[PDB]
């Protein structure tokens, strides 16, 4: 039994190292300790001091340097006895304060223990190194075991959730939270790996097909940002489906919010979608030739950033994992060849240079780029040319050929690009989903893997939607841990005095999504379908509704184009440039008409299927991105309320993507805004189990 043997892989990599006889003299000490601040400017930096004496209401302690401080017993962060260092579940701690909790994570982390229970939920501190705790060997260890008999792990939270689907005849969910780069996606993978092995078998084909559905998606929707080298630029809900017996019947992936703008623009040091790089690096010299390929350096979509690679990942190498993934999934070779044609053409569309012509409208002098794109897409180059610079609209009912300038022609090209890619994404997913939903499920476990909370020097509409989602997820923790918990108690009259935990990101949610009084998104919406509206008339309007009126909003004194929202995880400054176009998300109809006549079997499904090419009207208008997303979100929150939720809080150790560097400042922020200590306080003080 490997749980009980001190030499095993399980004991070596998931359990606290046996302390020696020196650490024993110290564990049995009668001395008592306190966590204090050496500089009261820096609240998150802690040193340890011995309590030397005590009055009625206060302790005196030794600082490290020399002196002796006095503070009130009520403002004292006491150090737990050292028998607690490395405890597996922090609800067991005698003292529940900030440095006390951080310290325990510090102890565990220093010997590579990334998982800690914080009562009912799991905490996962990111290692930024490979640690051998996800082998089949390790999966088997966790098969069936109750939570308090095995070490903390993601596999375990996964087992308990599974036991709970079978023992309550009720649907389950794993909500993995975290700012960008904190480890969400990695732990998501692990939930699926574990679920797959434990409840799998036709042969064992479905199982391999679900696992191999994530490298595809990752190639097309992950990219290098300044925060994460493998950042998910789309959100993911995965229902792993189970039969009446409790074996794997299927899986369905729902995606949210592809950052389509990445395809045509990256910030310094960042990358476009991995796929672009994988194609250019990993293709045969024959495949490069029929696609008119070159290196990344000769494409506008791939050479603006200064960076074409990521340290320790070979793009040549990832192209194989990806191709192998579309194989196992049952994408035909006609289908892949088209997929890389769509990807190849986007790059070419990117190389079209537009210049000023005789008058105010645009001409295209060199048609190398245009012709290449038309060639790989299966479309008439002269129809594309005209649809790009001279698209036709209605003026009243009259048909008017417009002649677009350099700025507007470029945007339209970009708009065509973003729609090609976005529709391509939607199609990969519906295809994957079709191979995998093969059975009417009796039960599911749902894994939520969102784009995590992010801030950049320049934060835009995408960031707002990313951060709004991260905010709703946080309130969803708040509702389950604190609001639902206590409204029971008080209803079962079993004698509870109400606690205000002081965690409520409601006023932030409402500022963004409220409809009456109107929130940011509704003011955006109203502005998008008002015809004299500009980015200037939009921010004035936002300032007008919220400056000095909502305690969650700021009009900055320093800029006339940014607004601040104070999120649970910090204040974010949003740039308004381009919001109206990002919300309307317009595409010229002549462009749509150019691509419906594609000789390509895939491109034609992106443009002719109502599934993928349609837009739901709203009276005299199309649905905005904000209203479409606010709704898909609400639709998911409704799916979650109907489940028993399990939470995993992923924690980023630092902001430099480094191993063995736990930055206290960075980790405590996250502990506060996540409500980690409030979650532990609710479990000590209260009564979870109720029959
Ligand atoms: O990526 C996109 C997605 Cl992912 C979706 Cl759902 C739609 Cl409706 C569109 C899109 N891109 C579009 C363009 Cl360029 C035009 C229209 Cl009318 C709809 C879309
Ligand atoms: Mg992710």
Swiss-Prot record:
The modification N6,N6-dimethyllysine is found at residue 129. Residues 85-691 form the Myosin motor domain. Residues 29-81 form the Myosin N-terminal SH3-like domain. ATP binds at residues 178-185. Residues 633-655 are annotated as: Actin-binding. It is found in: Cytoplasm, Cell cortex. Phosphorylation inhibits thick filament formation and reduces the actin-activated ATPase activity. Myosin is a protein that binds to actin and has ATPase activity that is activated by actin. Belongs to the TRAFAC class myosin-kinesin ATPase superfamily. Myosin family. Dictyostelium myosin-2 has no K(2)EDTA ATPase activity, perhaps correlated with the absence of a Cys at the SH-1 position (688). Limited proteolysis of myosin heavy chain produces 1 light meromyosin (LMM) and 1 heavy meromyosin (HMM). HMM can be further cleaved into 2 globular subfragments (S1) and 1 rod-shaped subfragment (S2). Myosin-2 heavy chain is two-headed. It self-assembles into filaments. Hexamer of 2 heavy chain subunits (MHC), 2 alkali light chain subunits (MLC) and 2 regulatory light chain subunits (MLC-2). Associates with elmoA. This is Myosin-2 heavy chain. It comes from Dictyostelium discoideum (Social amoeba). The chain holds residues 2 to 696 of 2116 of the full protein.
């Amino acid at each position: 039994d490997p749980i009980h043997d001190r030499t095993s892989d399980y004991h070596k990599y998931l359990k606290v190292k046996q302390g020696d006889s020196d650490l024993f003299k110290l564990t049995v000490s009668d001395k008592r300790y306190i966590w204090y601040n050496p500089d009261p400017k820096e609240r998150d930096s802690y040193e340890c001091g011995e309590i030397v004496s005590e009055t009625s209401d206060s302790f005196t302690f030794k600082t490290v340097d020399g002196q002796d401080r006095q503070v009130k017993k009520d403002d004292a962060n006491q150090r737990n006895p050292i028998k607690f260092d490395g405890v597996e579940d922090m609800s067991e701690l005698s003292y529940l304060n900030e440095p006390a909790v951080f310290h325990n994570l510090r102890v565990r982390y220093n010997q590579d223990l990334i998982y800690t229970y914080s009562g009912l939920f799991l905490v996962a501190v990111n290692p930024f190194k490979i640690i051998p705790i996800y082998t089949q060997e390790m999966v088997d260890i966790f098969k069936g075991r109750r939570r308090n008999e095995v070490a903390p792990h993601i596999f375990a939270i996964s087992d308990v959730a599974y036991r709970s689907m079978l023992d309550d005849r009720q649907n389950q969910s794993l909500l993995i939270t975290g700012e960008s780069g904190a480890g969400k996606t990695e732990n998501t993978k692990k939930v699926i790996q574990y679920l797959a092995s434990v409840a799998g078998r036709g042969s064992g084909v479905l199982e391999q097909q679900i696992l191999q559905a994530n490298p595809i998606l990752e190639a097309f929707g992950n990219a290098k940002t300044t925060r994460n080298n493998n950042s998910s630029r789309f959100g993911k809900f995965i229902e792993i489906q189970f039969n009446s017996a409790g074996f794997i019947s299927g899986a369905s992936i729902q995606s949210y919010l592809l950052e389509k703008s990445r395809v045509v623009f990256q910030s310094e040091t960042e990358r476009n979608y991995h796929i672009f790089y994988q194609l250019l690096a990993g293709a045969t010299a024959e495949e490069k030739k029929a696609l008119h390929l070159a290196g990344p350096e000769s494409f506008n979509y791939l050479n603006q950033s200064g960076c074409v690679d990521i340290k320790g990942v070979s793009d040549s190498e990832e192209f194989k994992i990806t191709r192998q993934a579309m194989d196992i999934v049952g994408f035909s070779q006609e289908e892949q060849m088209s997929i890389f044609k769509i990807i190849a053409g986007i790059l070419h569309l990117g190389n079209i240079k537009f210049e000023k012509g005789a008058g105010e409208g645009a001409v295209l002098k060199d048609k190398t780029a245009l012709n290449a794109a038309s060639t790989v897409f299966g479309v008439n180059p002269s129809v594309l040319e005209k649809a790009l610079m001279e698209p036709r609209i209605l003026a009243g009912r009259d048909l008017v050929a417009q002649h677009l300038n350099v700025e507007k022609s470029s945007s339209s090209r970009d708009a065509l690009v973003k729609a090609l890619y976005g529709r391509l994404f939607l199609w990969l997913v519906i295809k994957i989903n079709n191979v995998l939903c093969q059975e009417r499920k009796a039960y599911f476990i749902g894994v939520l893997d969102i784009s995590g909370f992010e801030i950049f020097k320049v934060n835009s509409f995408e960031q707002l939607c990313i951060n709004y989602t991260n905010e709703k997820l946080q309130q969803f923790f708040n509702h389950h841990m604190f609001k639902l918990e206590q409204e029971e108690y008080l209803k079962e009259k079993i004698n509870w005095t109400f606690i205000d935990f002081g965690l409520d990101s409601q006023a932030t949610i409402d500022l963004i999504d409220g409809r009456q009084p109107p929130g940011i998104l509704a003011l955006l919406d109203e502005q998008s379908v008002f015809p004299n509206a500009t980015d200037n008339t939009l921010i004035t309007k936002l300032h007008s509704h919220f400056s000095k009126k909502n305690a969650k909003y700021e009009e900055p004194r320093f800029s006339k184009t940014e607004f601040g929202v104070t999120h649970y995880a910090g204040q974010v400054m949003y740039e308004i440039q381009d919001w109206l176009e990002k919300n309307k998300d317009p595409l010229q109809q002549d462009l749509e008409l150019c691509f419906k006549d594609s000789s390509d079997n895939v491109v034609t499904k992106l443009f002719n299927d109502p599934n993928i090419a349609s837009r739901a009207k709203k009276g005299a208008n199309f649905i905005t991105v904000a209203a479409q997303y606010k709704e898909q979100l609400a639709s998911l929150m409704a799916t979650l309320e109907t489940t028993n939720p399990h939470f995993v809080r992923c924690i980023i150790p630092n902001n430099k993507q480094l191993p063995a560097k736990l930055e206290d400042k960075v980790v405590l922020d996250q502990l506060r805004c996540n409500g980690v200590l409030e979650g532990i306080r609710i479990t000590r003080k209260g009564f979870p189990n109720r029959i």
